[PDB]
Ligand binder design. Structure first.
Ligand SMILES: Cc1nn(-c2nc3c(F)cc(F)cc3s2)c(O)c1C(c1ccccc1C(=O)O)c1c(C)nn(-c2nc3c(F)cc(F)cc3s2)c1O
Ligand SMILES: [Zn+2]
Length: 344
């Protein structure tokens, strides 16, 4: 059924051609928002990080990160979670959001939301409150934009990342060092009621960079000889999960699975298969099959290390229970045995 996979990819490309216009609407609203926000003393250095689509099958649902540099940050890991932190300061335009020594995600979300509500009120845009994403904008008839606030730190990545991003045999030890000199991000995100002043690490910019500059060869996919199917494999994996989540929206079994699980699984497969010749475009069928198989193996063993924080198990039974993983395992295996009927 490799041809059927290409059929899917054809459809997905069409949907992207016919959304350029929507992305224009989004850029205009977002540019407006950023100008107003930059006049607030708290948000003076607000900017775009890189739009993106968390759901490949939802072309009108956009996703945008507003970054804000926080100099001289000091992090305090929450409860050995490796991914969630309290934000302190070494020595402040954010001082108004302090709860004691801690930058309050609650308060900084409050103001972020207030200001956005103001500007939307002045513009045919409508808003709705969602911590990350913080708000959802309705633009025109059927365009949504989730906006995440993200603190930026130009300091060294936290200790939990020391053994992560194991790209050395694939993208190289040089690239790994360059990427770890880039900043990292913190999004407001409560941890399990719930600890309500934690911030979670975010490496979405690094994920973006790897996906778009993904070969061992620097010229991978820039000529006929070197076309690979890495990006097509990830698209197919995302579309598979999205179709299944839609199909079983009435069950609780697939609610905790997201595109981040699929994308994490994929990067692990890139690590296991570092040579570009292992991703020949002519081998799309077996390449996707081997991505599907890897994700399934993560499901059955309940092991999916965060690609950047290897001690963080995305498939822990504290996060997703065994029954849910077994259901998804059964459904994917059915799809794969039947040439993926869910695609149509
Ligand atoms: C990737 C993703 N996909 N997805 C869906 N996919 C589907 C789908 F496929 C079908 C469907 F119907 C519905 C959805 S929604 C989603 O919501 C996300 C969220 C996200 C998207 C947009 C705004 C905010 C969030 C957010 O919550 O932060 C997301 C992001 C971008 N990063 N991230 C993590 N990064 C780290 C990390 F760096 C370290 C660590 F230890 C843990 C984590 S977790 C995470 O969880
Ligand atoms: Zn390539």
């Amino acid at each position: 059924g490799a041809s059927k996979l290409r059929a899917v990819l054809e459809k997905l490309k069409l949907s992207r051609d016919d959304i350029s216009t929507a992305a224009g609407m989004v850029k205009g609203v977002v540019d407006h928002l950023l100008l107003r926000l930059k006049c607030d003393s708290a948000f003076r250095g607000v900017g775009l990080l890189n739009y993106e689509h968390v759901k490949i099958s939802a072309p009108n649902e956009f996703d945008v990160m507003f970054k804000l540099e926080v100099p001289r940050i000091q992090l305090e890991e929450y409860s050995n979670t490796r991914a969630y932190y309290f934000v302190k300061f070494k020595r402040n335009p954010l001082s108004q959001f302090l709860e004691g020594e801690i930058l309050s995600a609650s308060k900084m979300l409050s103001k972020f939301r207030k200001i956005i509500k103001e500007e939307i009120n002045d513009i045919d845009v409508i808003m709705k409150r969602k911590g990350s994403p913080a708000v959802t904008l309705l633009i025109s008839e059927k365009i949504s934009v989730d906006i995440t606030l993200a603190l930026e730190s130009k300091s060294s990545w936290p200790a939990s990342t020391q053994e992560g991003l194991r790209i050395q045999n694939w993208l190289s030890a040089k690239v790994r060092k360059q990427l770890r000199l880039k900043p990292f991000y913190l999004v407001p995100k409560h941890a399990k009621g719930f600890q309500e002043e934690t911030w979670r690490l975010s490496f979405s910019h690094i994920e973006k960079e790897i996906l778009n500059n993904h070969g061992k060869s620097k010229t991978c996919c820039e000529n006929k000889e070197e076309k690979c199917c890495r990006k097509d494999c990830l698209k197919l994996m995302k579309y598979l999960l999205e179709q299944l989540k839609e199909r079983f929206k009435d069950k609780k079994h697939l609610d905790k699975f997201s595109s981040y699980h699929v994308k994490t699984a994929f990067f692990h497969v890139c690590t296991q298969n570092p040579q570009d010749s292992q991703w020949d475009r002519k081998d799309l069928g077996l390449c996707f099959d081997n991505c599907v198989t890897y994700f399934l193996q993560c499901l059955r063993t309940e092991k999916l290390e965060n690609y950047f924080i290897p001690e963080f198990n995305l498939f822990s039974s504290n996060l997703i229970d065994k029954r849910s993983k077994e259901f998804l395992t059964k459904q994917i295996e059915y799809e794969r045995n039947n040439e993926f009927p869910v695609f149509d």
